[PDB]
Design a binder for this molecule. Structure first.
Ligand SMILES: Nc1ncnc2c1ncn2[C@@H]1O[C@H](COP(=O)(O)OP(=O)(O)NP(=O)(O)O)[C@@H](O)[C@H]1O
Ligand SMILES: O=P(O)(O)O[C@@H]1[C@@H](O)[C@@H](O)[C@@H](OP(=O)(O)O)[C@H](OP(=O)(O)O)[C@H]1O
Ligand SMILES: [Mn+2]
Ligand SMILES: [Mn+2]
Length: 275
């Protein structure tokens, strides 16, 4: 029905118009959604209708991706081998912002993960925290990770920080689709068509795509959709340089491994389909 329905049952706000949702405006994301409405990827992303002012603050007017669905099941998949901007590595070297919260969140999962100095600081840098998160999840090895699942009653889970192996990921999607062969076939058809669109997209070859997700939505009527969301960390390459989105990331090359992720994701769903 609507995302705000689930939020009720915080960058998001209810829109006045039916089938729309408001997201806190960010300059990079607004720039990206405007470009995307004129790109090959237009149909692979939520409709962007412009910006509205609400309680003296700027909001993106977006398609509510849950509108078409009757009690939607939702899975958010963060795409890429790298999940932070290269500029974070520079800031952490010249002027580190020590994060006590990120130390705690790290300590919780692996008490041996922090260094002697991090233990002394009770704090880590963001890039260090994000690189650690990439390695204990599937991000580093498969180029994506499951972030959360969110059904319509309100039953939700974010308990996937150590979902890392191909077979672990397959079992999460297995549980998500609950043996619905039609939903899985539709998901795979949609991902195949998204990969084809990304491989010809003028936007995609010219932009570093960090921290974006694929949103999987299905319902008990076997309706299934997938969209790219969250362009808040998607930035243009300088002087007409391009990415292949498959080759390994090395500081300076701005590679995101987005298509390495999508290739592996398609391979896992295709594997599940044959079980
Ligand atoms: N257009 C949309 N329609 C419906 N639901 C949406 C839409 N965009 C986002 N959502 C939901 O909101 C969640 C967060 O979206 P996202 O764009 O990643 O926001 P964010 O504030 O950047 N969150 P995060 O990346 O986790 O720090 C998604 O996982 C969906 O469940
Ligand atoms: O709690 P988690 O999931 O272990 O870590 C989150 C991470 O998932 C992501 O939401 C990140 O925001 P980003 O993608 O850079 O916009 C957050 O960073 P920050 O706290 O907002 O700096 C970081 O904490
Ligand atoms: Mn996001
Ligand atoms: Mn985000």
């Amino acid at each position: 029905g609507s995302h705000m329905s689930w939020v009720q049952l915080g960058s998001f706000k209810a829109a006045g118009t039916s089938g729309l949702i408001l997201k806190r405006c960010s300059e990079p994301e607004r720039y990206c959604l405007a470009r995307l409405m004129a790109d090959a990827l237009r149909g692979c992303v939520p409709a962007f209708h412009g910006v509205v002012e609400r309680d003296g603050e700027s909001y993106l007017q977006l398609q509510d991706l849950l509108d078409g669905f009757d009690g939607p099941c939702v899975l958010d998949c963060k795409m890429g081998v790298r999940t932070y901007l290269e500029e974070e590595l520079t800031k952490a070297r010249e002027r580190p912002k020590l994060r006590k919260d990120m130390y705690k969140k790290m300590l919780a999962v692996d008490p041996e993960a922090p260094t002697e100095e991090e233990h002394a600081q009770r704090a880590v840098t963001k890039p260090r925290y994000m690189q650690w998160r990439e390695g204990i999840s599937s991000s580093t090895t498969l180029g994506f990770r499951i972030e959360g699942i969110k059904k319509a009653d309100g039953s939700c889970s974010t308990d996937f920080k150590t979902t890392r192996s191909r077979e672990q990921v397959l079992r999460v999607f297995e549980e998500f689709v609950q043996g619905d062969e039609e939903v899985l076939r539709r998901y795979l058809n949609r991902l195949q068509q998204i990969r084809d669109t990304l491989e010809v997209s003028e936007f995609f070859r010219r932009h570093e795509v960090i921290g974006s997700s694929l949103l999987f939505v299905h319902d008990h009527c076997h309706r299934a959709g997938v969209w790219l969301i969250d362009f808040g960390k998607t930035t243009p390459l300088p002087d007409g340089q391009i990415l292949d989105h498959r080759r390994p990331w090395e500081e300076g090359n701005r590679e995101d491994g987005y298509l390495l992720g999508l290739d592996n994701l398609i391979g896992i769903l295709a594997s599940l389909a044959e079980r």
